Subunit: 254 residues, 3 copies
Amino acid sequence: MLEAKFEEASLFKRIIDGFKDCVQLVNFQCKEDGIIAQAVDDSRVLLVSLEIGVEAFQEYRCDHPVTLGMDLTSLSKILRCGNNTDTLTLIADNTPDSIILLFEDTKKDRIAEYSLKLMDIDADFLKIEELQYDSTLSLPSSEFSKIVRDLSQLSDSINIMITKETIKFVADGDIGGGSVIIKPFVDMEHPETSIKLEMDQPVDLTFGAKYLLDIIKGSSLSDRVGIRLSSEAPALFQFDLKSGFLQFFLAPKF
Amino acid sequence: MLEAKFEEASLFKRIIDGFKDCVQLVNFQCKEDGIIAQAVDDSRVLLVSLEIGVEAFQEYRCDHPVTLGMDLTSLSKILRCGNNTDTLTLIADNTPDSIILLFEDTKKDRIAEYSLKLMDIDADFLKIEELQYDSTLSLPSSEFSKIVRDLSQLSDSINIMITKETIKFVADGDIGGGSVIIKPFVDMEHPETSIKLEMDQPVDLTFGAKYLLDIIKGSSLSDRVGIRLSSEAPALFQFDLKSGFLQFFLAPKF
Amino acid sequence: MLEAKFEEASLFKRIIDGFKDCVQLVNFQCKEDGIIAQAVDDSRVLLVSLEIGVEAFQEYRCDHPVTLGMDLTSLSKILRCGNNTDTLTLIADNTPDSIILLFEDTKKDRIAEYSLKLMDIDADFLKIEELQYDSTLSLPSSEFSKIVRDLSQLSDSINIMITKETIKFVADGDIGGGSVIIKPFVDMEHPETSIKLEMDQPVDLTFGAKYLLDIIKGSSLSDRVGIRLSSEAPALFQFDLKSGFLQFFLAPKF
């Protein structure tokens, strides 16, 4: 029997928003020490990896490994049904035909129980993360969100260029162009505005805006975003959770 | 001469919102002791009955019965023109070709006078309400609104099932399912959250969500909704006014 | 070299909103004492004239006259990229191939530099304004905005009728009609609510709502709108700036 109790349904809903507009069906491998889930879009240039530790729940019990694949188009609908700041409990019994989502609230007033029909999905799990990445920066997700949103106005292709102590986002379109530059700094008034950068080797990569716009969906999950870049491999965009994370692996072109 | 003065135009606009997305043209039978109006959608499974007593206005005068049929698509447009919290006065003279809607405000600053061309419409008024209904409950319109909106995500058909001291709204779709259960209780901290239920005989009816979504439009008119159910006849959904009401008669299928 | 520094980008963005949904490409004739710009829609019934004095900027330098034509569809996109309450600096060098838009903020945190490819556009500048107009009124832009928006619901044609101390906006549609009447008055509690009217000769003109709706876009630029009317020539709708203005010349039909 599985019983994973989110303190606030928002968390799970906001997590699903990460996968939503970029992948369809996802296997949520549940087990002893939490949940993990992976998915890849049709064109195989964006991979989303989720890990949720036990501490991210208020209560978590999984007697025995249970893999629950489900349609996120359909799951999300049920997430709409819930009350944003209400306790959500996932329930399942061995070899589920279905998973039960369970909303509660303050008073035993309205307690909604939904059920989602599950689906068999062949896995073939990937493990592409690398040991070392040529460059590794971290900035407020809100700032990174802005930069992408703005430069997306001009070009369908955003170039990220990193020399030492210099991160340059560039967009060049038929219709004009644009470029933001930021620098590392420790902000003691509020360290959550800080910009970090550990450049081992410089990088000059170009990603599709279509996907960078999907990646910034996770901005609702963490104050900061973790962007690891190397020129031979996909970039790691990571939003950290209380215990766990949401990772986006994006391959740049050319 | 007719002169019906709403204190706030919102009331009349919110009333029209009740008829709007479910019926088209409506005869507003005006007379001595107020206004009444009835309408039925194309498929004849939803009937809307309105009664507005004199006390619901701040000033009301109707010398002589005047039946004013009008296009609610067109009327609503004029209701858009008005200032939400402004006094609205309906004016008409014997055998109107048209009705005049009259907005005012605080200062004699802007005073807008609109006119709506009326239409001849054959009536055939219905009187289908019954003496006794097998079950009769009442709950906060906001709560009932939620229940319908949520379960509408999953199924195009919502089943309401009432045994003693047990009201169970159920939705079962191709894509999972859902079900809310509520109980009667007197809430003294705020009696407007109370749930009442007088079950003479149990009921197990299923209505189309399409229409239950239209019915919850009246949630802007009253804190509570009055749902009377019987298994042989259409359900009565009623939102009470200061003096009057807005009723929705809905036939369940099968 | 040109360097025009708006204190807040909003101003320039809100100015562009004036031209936006009514004209396409516009030549911004920049020179010593500021910027001016003119444009005419396809059907040539709406002409927009802008003047921005030096005092409207916080810093302005134009060594030498520079005419910069540009696509407002495309310019606006870049105006989306900026931070509403941030300093915006237009930069250009002799015979630009392009103009540079430059956002800043509080801290030297994010400083975005965009560039817009310019376009050659043949001018043929118009000077149609007249010495005297038969009638000249001024009212709160918010009020005038409302009047147009409301009466636009009913008719695609709005008639403005001015006799002495009487301004009557009228709309008459297939579906009913409407008419607002206002009077001149000095409001000492707040003179910005005042309504002025200097009628030399009466006027009875009818304009297309399509365009009056475009004209009220400038309501974001000034508290009041200046409407000058004469029966032989286009109406002057003018929203005043700190130093300058945004004018809309509209020809009435029949």
